[PDB]
């Protein structure tokens, strides 16, 4: 429960990334829907005659660095608070809640995750995953 420490330049960059990553395509592999053997991850087109590798606008969008998010707000949570994957209670003593927010480890049991959330609530660090 704290105000996000983001200056108006970074607020504009955050909204810019919101719009531009709303418009960003999913970058599925070519012909992934046709065959059930194929996955949803990106593989570079390689055939000499393939229409995606030839950059047909009707066939999709090629993976390329022009689509990248703004450099300042890159890697930030959609809430804006930066993410720190917390895999232990000792990682709460090297993060400050003024502009960040933790993410508790998936394999953590209730016994130590309860202690983690208690220490975060007393310290003030924002937590993305929890229960209520």
Considering only residues 66 through 95, tell me which ones interact with RNA, judged by CB under 7 A: 66-80, 85, 87-90
- As measured in angstroms, the least distance from the Cβ of 95 to RNA is 14
Q: Tell whether residue 30 is a contact of RNA (CB under 7 A).
A: yes
How is residue 114 written in tokens?
A: 């309860």
Give CA–CA dist 31/29, Å, rounded: 6
Site for RNA in 36-65 (CB under 7 A): 36-39, 41-43, 45-65
Give CA–CA dist 119/122, Å, rounded: 5
Q: Which of 1, 93, 94, 111 binds RNA (CB under 7 A)?
A: 111
Give CA–CA dist 30/51, Å, rounded: 9
- As measured in angstroms, the least distance from the Cβ of 99 to RNA is 13
Q: How many CB atoms lie within 10 A of CB 61?
A: 15
Q: Tell whether residue 21 is a contact of RNA (CB under 7 A).
A: yes
């Amino acid at each position: 429960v704290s105000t996000l420490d983001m200056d108006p330049e970074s607020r504009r960059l955050f909204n810019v990334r919101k719009v531009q990553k709303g418009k960003k395509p999913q970058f599925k592999r070519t012909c992934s829907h046709k065959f059930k053997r194929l996955d949803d991850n990106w593989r570079r087109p390689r055939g000499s005659q393939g229409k995606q590798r030839r950059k047909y606008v009707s066939k999709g969008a090629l993976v390329q660095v022009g689509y990248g998010s703004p450099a300042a707000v890159k890697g930030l949570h959609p809430s804006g608070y930066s993410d720190v994957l917390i895999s232990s209670i000792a990682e709460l003593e090297l993060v400050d809640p003024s502009y960040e927010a933790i993410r508790i480890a998936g394999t953590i049991g209730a016994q130590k995750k309860a202690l983690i959330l208690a220490k975060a609530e007393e310290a003030g660090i924002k937590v993305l995953n929890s229960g209520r």
